[PDB]
Swiss-Prot record, chain B:
Pfam families for this protein: Ribosomal_L28e
Keywords, sorted A to Z: Ribonucleoprotein, Ribosomal protein
Protein name: Large ribosomal subunit protein eL28
Gene Ontology terms, MF aspect: structural constituent of ribosome
The keyword Flavoprotein appears for this protein: no
One BP term from GO: translation
Family membership noted in the UniProt record: Belongs to the eukaryotic ribosomal protein eL28 family.
InterPro entries registered for this protein in UniProt: Ribosomal_eL28 (IPR002672), Ribosomal_eL28/Mak16 (IPR029004)
GO cellular component, one term: ribosome
PANTHER family referenced in this protein's UniProt entry, alphabetically: 60S RIBOSOMAL PROTEIN L28
Gene3D superfamilies: 3.30.390.110
Residues making up the signal peptide according to the UniProt record: none
Swiss-Prot record, chain E:
Recorded family membership: Belongs to the eukaryotic ribosomal protein eL18 family.
Keyword Nucleotidyltransferase: no
Annotated region described as Disordered, given as residue ranges: 157-192
Name assigned to this protein: Large ribosomal subunit protein eL18
Cellular component GO terms held in the UniProt record: cytosolic large ribosomal subunit
One Pfam family of this chain: Ribosomal_L18
Domain of life, per lineage: Eukaryota
Length: 113, 120, 215, 144, 192, 63, 126, 36
RNA sequence: AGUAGCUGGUUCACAUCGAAGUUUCCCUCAGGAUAGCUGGUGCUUGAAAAAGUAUUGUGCGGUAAAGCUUUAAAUGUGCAACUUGCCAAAGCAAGGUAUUAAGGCACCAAGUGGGCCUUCUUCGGUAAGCGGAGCAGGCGAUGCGGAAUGAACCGCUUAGGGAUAUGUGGCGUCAAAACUUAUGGGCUCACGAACAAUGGAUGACGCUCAAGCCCAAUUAGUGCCCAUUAUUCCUUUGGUAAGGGCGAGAAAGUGUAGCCCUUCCGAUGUAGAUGUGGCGUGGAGGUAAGGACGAAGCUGAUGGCGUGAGCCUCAGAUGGACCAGCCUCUAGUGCAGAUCU
RNA sequence: CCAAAACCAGCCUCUACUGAGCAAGAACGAGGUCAUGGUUUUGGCGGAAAUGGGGUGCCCCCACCCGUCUUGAAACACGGACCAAGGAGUCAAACAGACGCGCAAGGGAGAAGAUAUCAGUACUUCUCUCGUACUGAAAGGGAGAUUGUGGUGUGCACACUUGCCCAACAC
């Protein structure tokens, strides 16, 4: 159960198409956001850190671990209830056939099988 | 010594798999792929592993006696606390995990026979 | 061996805490019956009784930490009144009565009742331990803090911070200053003196009411 | 390494540590040591007190080779004597001999407590070195 | 909502981990971190913290200065008491000014090739912190020492020279450049 | 402009450091000299008897 | 705009009313061993060796006695530090302290409320 | 050689009954006194 | 590519701390240097030389008041807790056998060196939202809650949240609360509710046995509402904080996906300083791996992860051939703003 | 998965004196609560359901355009139409402190050479350079104590029940 589910967006990203939504800390004395007036956007801080034993845990309940080939699956053989292999985006559909019928045989989870 | 070696390979090695900030070992001889000195058996003077070998559980072992002769430094032995009885024969502390891997190696072997047979 | 010697001690300590607080209960019931006889003697004698002066005030910081002057700001630190509704027991030396007089607009205080002392020490009581602020929970906790054959019970503490103690400093200093909640039902005016119809300053025995809503 | 500069840390913090006010200019004072006698006067006088002035006789065309008189103390003659050769050196017996020009030293200052005798062989000697060296039963022999 | 005035000023700056890249310091900190925690000994707590210091703050010691400080220590020892081990958390350097030294038993991170040979020429052992832990797991008659750092030429520069009390050394490539007439100079001495 | 505002605040940040203890920089030097010179004659004699005392303690300790 | 050595001493170095005149014999026969506490209360009748002004009324230990003068170490708050000053002073300007006279008395000696039976008792009303 | 040298729930204490009875063992002997 | 003490700009995140507008000096006054303030690094050891506070003892003072230029406050302020001279001489001298709180020291270095307001005290000025000082506090650099509104007033100062309770301020509507409470007192008929000209301001309405004023109150001669505050709970982060421990895990560990657990205290912040097994870019030494079963790139109600910079996955009914990871090296490395090109 | 109830714990709320009053103390009883902990129970939902995210709208509420110099910016102060690419603490050198590494009373090379195989790596002579000694304008001179800390004061650790004191400061 996350502290904040919203992104901490950059101030006024919505007005300027070029600005990425990605966070930049506001600066300028007069910044409404760094002066942290109440009606303004929030800034990220240590206090929004997620609970630390639920951290990094995907709703499946697994921590994702990158996988590239069939050998990686054995890195997850003994901790298959803790880690879930997420096959890399660029492995071929060829190789993924091999990772997948083997990630099945081993009882290891895969996020994108 | 291993205290020194581990402090050498610890920040990087072929086996460390620091992916997504998670750190698992690609090490053949580690039992739970946790990048830890207790487990980094490729590094340890003594080591034990309980990998499968075609339906059979396999329990590769590495007493230190071989020393540094990689061709014969590791000694396999095919074969449920009995496998742990073998692994503790070389590494006593590894045994509690070596048992639990040795089980999970069995449920995997049972699980895949169910899966390999179902793939028909 | 030690495992059971921990029992011989934990059993011996409540045997002591029983023995202690049996004395303190008697030392209260007796001390006050004796203090009733005299004021009652005197009324028969057509005669007044000058009650012994308070030897302990339960000072309570009552204004917040903003805009406070360097002299008041130091006296509050030496009282260990560093937050708002912090509380400490300070005994009423002339030198203290002159510290309290220097920061009264920042504090409410008076002369705690034995009950007020119990509630703070039992409910809000926290020992300093290895610099840790440690909630009182065991008499074991107290004897370890206070390596003092005198101070073992939580009843030892309440007597010290009420009777005025010979260890009133040894005791009250080993307590973290009390972190009271704001008085339920509110204050009156943290700006006026109590006799002005406000809040700050000495309010004598009445502090027990004010401080009761807080504890 | 560019990675490590705090140039790289303060990428994003607009004034790179130079301040919003009091802006990072160019030469807010002069180039180099300008105003050493003016607006940086408090600075040289505090730190480089002797910096301004003239102090002594000139030596036109100084030649340092003629002036070359490097020194080794009695207390340091073990640096030259072989530890093996130096092993037994009674004052009344045979002594290691130590040419100092060979070893690059010219004068022989008579510092600490020499106690192992040696026949030091050097261009110059201190008043106290030849004395100490004799009292140890050794002997400087003058060379050039 | 708290007075904090004067709290931050009381914060201390201490090293809690070595900056040394050297693997052996880290096996050596691995030991005495352990040994300092698992023993009640104050010696392990000193060897452990000094071991965490800068090589600046781990100044080297002359073997000359060990032989002095050691015999000066050991000379009083009641007969049949063997002399303390001479531990230093730093290098031990040979001293030409003391040709003959006592059979010392020095223990240090590092020894000069000269110190190590003179140390063994006297028959003394030149042991490391490894077997220091194995012989004196506690600082039992160890004699922990430090090398000097006041005579270090960096500190000769501390302060100003121009300030009257001071005898700081001015920074100068040119020794004759900031030379000055006796008249113009700062007063040498000055009471604090 | 010459306001002394924020100065005692800025001064009490690192406190008014209290003055050095009398046992430290207790140099004489500019002390009335004739006393100062006789003091050297005594202190130098304290040194010869301090050293002479330690020479005694060692010879005493060879027993 | 004009701070010479005795700026603003119109009252400070004034003799008290009907207490004018140079220091007496009780002054002159006071003696100062070093490390004695003293009060640098400047006396105007004596002008040689007069303390600056800051040092008026300050206490400090003697660190030095010359034939007519008493060196005194007197702390001065300069800024964030108390610099420890060494004023030189003619002995008239130094009144020996009693600042420790209580404490010396101590190691010299180291060597509630009840019924009030009072009967007079006027009413307090206006 | 090295092993040898090695060194070898209630909040409110005033109103909670068991907590107070623990801090102040005599309290129940005192509460019995309270009846009447 | 003249120079510019001037103007403008100076690109990732997070965490840790965090100012100054004053001193001396300068052809100095829009700038330096200097010291202070601040950071970092330590060092040193742990009621060391602790204290913006009293008490007690001992000095200092000449302002208000007084007085007719003199007595004298309060607030203050200091302080304390054998050998070798002198003497006439061996005796003197000198050196020797209350509360609270970790103390001191060093190094390097920044920003700053336009301040402003207010409190009280003043000085100058006819007066000022005026010039000048002293004191302290503030704003600057800081919100939040309140005064309708307000840089500095009031309260309170600030990690992400919940309960509780408050502070200043309120409780007729706006507006949470007296569904217009009192089983309180007076006063009031026309206005009334801290710091001459666009029509229009107790904030608005409206209120008048008040919804005004003074006073007191709290269910009544038998209270309630609202804070970034307090307390408590959960979580985070920091601690160069305190301990314990060493079905899957149990690493001797600064720092990671932190070796694990426990407890405690802290958390704002401009300039600035620092940290970061912090992010990210082009390249290199390595390692490991991927790709025509589709690399990079690009698109994206593709979700997922991370406080965040960001990463990852999904999908392209995109592309067409290169390339991510990890440790080390490197830099022409991160952009809404320069009347930028 | 949504619910609801229970239990336990926690937590919270809701006599005495006095001359009818208080400055006054508990008790019994009951309630509340999981955005408190542990104990399930019971039902509801189950090509879909369910929780989460995302999107769009609304509702109530909060909310002054940013950057900027400035005591003070929402300012009737400056810059600001959009987007893409680019764009600004760099390189050298001389010092310094700090930190890492190497050796250490020495350290280091440079130019160059010689070799083996590739502007690299390996190798080395001779020197030079910084340092171990300072001072004086200069001629010049040039530092141990009474087999060893020059003394003394304060001083880790260890030792022994005070010693030695490392460093370090001071004298
Ligand atoms: Mg109120
Ligand atoms: Mg006020
Ligand atoms: Mg900043
Ligand atoms: Mg800077
Ligand atoms: Mg500048
Ligand atoms: Mg300026
Ligand atoms: Mg010249
Ligand atoms: Mg030296
Ligand atoms: Mg100015
Ligand atoms: Mg006067
Ligand atoms: Mg600018
Ligand atoms: Mg802060
Ligand atoms: Mg300007
Ligand atoms: Mg007058
Ligand atoms: Mg008057
Ligand atoms: Mg408001
Ligand atoms: Mg309403
Ligand atoms: Mg912060
Ligand atoms: Mg490039
Ligand atoms: Mg879109
Ligand atoms: Mg660029
Ligand atoms: Mg302006
Ligand atoms: Mg030198």
């Amino acid at each position: 159960v996350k502290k904040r589910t919203k992104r901490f967006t950059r101030h006024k990203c919505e007005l300027f198409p070029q600005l990425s939504s990605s966070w930049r800390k506001p600066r300028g004395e007069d910044s409404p956001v760094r002066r942290r007036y109440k009606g303004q956007k929030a800034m990220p801080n240590k206090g929004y850190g997620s609970d630390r034993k639920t951290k990094y845990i995907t709703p499946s309940g697994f921590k994702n671990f990158p996988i590239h080939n069939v050998q990686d699956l054995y890195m997850l053989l003994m901790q298959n209830r803790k880690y879930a292999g997420v096959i890399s985006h660029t492995v071929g559909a060829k190789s993924r056939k091999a990772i997948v019928r083997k990630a099945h045989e081993l009882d290891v989870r895969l996020i994108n099988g | 010594s291993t205290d020194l070696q581990w402090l050498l390979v610890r920040q990087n090695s072929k086996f460390l798999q620091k992916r997504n900030g998670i750190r698992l070992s690609s090490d053949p001889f580690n039992n739970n792929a946790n990048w830890t000195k207790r487990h980094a058996g490729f590094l340890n003077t003594k080591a034990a592993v309980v990998k499968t070998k075609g339906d059979r559980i396999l329990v590769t072992t590495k007493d230190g006696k071989a020393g540094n002769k990689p061709k014969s430094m590791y000694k396999k032995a095919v074969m449920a606390s009995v496998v742990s009885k073998a692994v503790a024969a070389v590494r006593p502390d590894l045994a509690s995990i070596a048992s639990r891997r040795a089980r999970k190696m069995a449920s995997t072997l049972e699980h895949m026979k169910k899966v390999r047979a179902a793939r028909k | 061996k030690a495992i059971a010697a921990n029992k011989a001690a934990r059993v011996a300590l409540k045997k002591a805490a029983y023995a202690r607080g049996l004395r303190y209960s008697r030392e209260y019931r007796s001390a006050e019956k004796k203090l009733v006889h005299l004021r009652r003697q005197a009324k028969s004698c057509g005669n007044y009784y000058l009650e012994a002066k308070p030897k302990v005030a339960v000072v309570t910081r009552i204004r917040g930490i903003a805009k406070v002057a360097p002299k008041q700001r130091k006296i509050l630190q030496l009282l260990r009144l560093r937050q708002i509704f912090n509380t400490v027991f300070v005994r009423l030396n002339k030198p203290m009565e002159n510290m309290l007089r220097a920061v009264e607009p920042y504090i409410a205080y008076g002369y705690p009742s034995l009950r007020t002392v119990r509630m703070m020490v039992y409910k809000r009581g926290h020992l300093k331990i290895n610099g840790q602020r440690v909630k009182i929970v065991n008499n074991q906790m107290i004897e370890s803090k206070y390596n003092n054959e005198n101070i073992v019970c939580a009843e030892d503490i309440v007597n010290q911070i009420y009777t005025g103690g010979k260890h009133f400093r040894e005791v009250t200093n080993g307590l973290w200053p009390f972190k009271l909640s704001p008085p339920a039902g509110g204050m009156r005016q943290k700006r006026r003196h109590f006799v002005e119809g406000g809040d700050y300053g000495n309010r004598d025995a009445l502090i027990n009411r004010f401080l009761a809503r807080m504890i | 390494p560019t990675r490590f500069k705090k140039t790289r840390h303060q990428r994003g913090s607009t004034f790179c540590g130079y301040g919003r006010v009091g802006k990072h200019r160019k030469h807010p004072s002069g180039r180099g040591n300008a105003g050493g006698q003016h607006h940086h006067r408090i600075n040289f006088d505090k730190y480089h007190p002797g910096y301004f002035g003239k102090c002594g006789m000139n030596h036109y065309h100084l030649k340092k080779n003629p002036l070359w008189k490097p020194t080794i103390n009695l207390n340091n003659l073990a640096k030259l004597i072989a530890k093996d050769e130096a092993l037994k050196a009674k004052k009344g017996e045979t002594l290691p001999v130590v040419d100092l020009l060979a070893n690059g030293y010219s004068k022989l200052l008579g510092n600490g407590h020499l106690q192992t005798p040696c026949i030091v062989k050097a261009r110059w000697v201190s008043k106290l070195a030849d004395k100490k060296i004799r009292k140890a039963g050794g002997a400087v022999v003058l060379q050039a | 909502g708290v007075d904090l005035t004067g709290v931050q000023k009381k914060k201390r700056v201490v090293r809690h981990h070595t900056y040394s890249t050297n693997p052996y310091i880290k096996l050596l900190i691995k030991l005495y971190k352990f040994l300092a925690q698992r023993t009640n000994s104050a010696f392990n707590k000193l060897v452990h913290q000094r071991l965490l210091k800068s090589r600046s703050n781990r100044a080297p010691i002359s073997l000359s200065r060990i032989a002095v400080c050691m015999k000066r220590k050991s000379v009083w020892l009641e007969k049949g008491k063997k002399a303390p081990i001479a531990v230093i958390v730093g290098d031990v350097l040979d001293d030409v000014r003391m040709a003959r030294i006592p059979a010392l038993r020095v223990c240090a991170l590092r020894f000069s090739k000269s110190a190590r040979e003179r140390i063994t020429g006297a028959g003394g052992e030149c042991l490391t912190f490894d077997q220091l832990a194995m012989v004196a797991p506690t600082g039992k008659n160890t004699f922990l020492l430090r090398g000097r750092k006041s005579g270090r030429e960096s500190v000769k520069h501390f302060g100003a020279a121009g300030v009257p009390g001071s005898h700081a050394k001015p920074f100068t490539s040119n020794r004759g450049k900031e030379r000055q007439r006796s008249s113009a100079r700062r007063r040498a001495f000055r009471h604090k | 402009n010459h306001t002394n505002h924020n100065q005692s605040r800025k001064n009490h940040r690192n406190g008014i450091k209290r003055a050095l203890p009398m046992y430290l920089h207790n140099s004489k030097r500019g002390s009335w000299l004739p006393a100062l010179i006789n003091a050297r004659r005594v202190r130098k004699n304290n040194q010869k008897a301090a050293v002479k005392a330690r020479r005694e303690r060692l010879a005493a300790h060879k027993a | 705009h004009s701070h010479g050595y005795k700026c603003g001493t119109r009252h400070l170095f004034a003799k008290k009313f009907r207490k004018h005149g140079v220091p007496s014999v009780s002054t002159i026969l006071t003696n100062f061993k070093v490390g004695d506490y003293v009060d640098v209360v400047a006396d105007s009748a004596v002008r040689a060796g007069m303390p600056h002004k800051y040092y008026h009324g300050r206490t400090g230990i003697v660190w030095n006695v010359t034939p007519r003068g008493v060196g005194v170490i007197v702390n001065k708050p300069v800024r964030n530090r108390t610099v420890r000053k060494r004023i030189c002073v003619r002995f008239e300007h130094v009144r020996k302290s009693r600042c420790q006279e209580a404490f010396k008395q101590k190691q010299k000696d180291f060597l509630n409320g009840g019924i009030v039976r009072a009967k007079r008792v006027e009413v307090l009303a206006r | 050689e090295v092993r040898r040298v090695l060194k070898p729930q209630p909040t409110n204490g005033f109103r909670n009954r068991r907590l107070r009875l623990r801090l102040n063992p005599f309290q129940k002997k005192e509460s019995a006194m309270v009846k009447g």
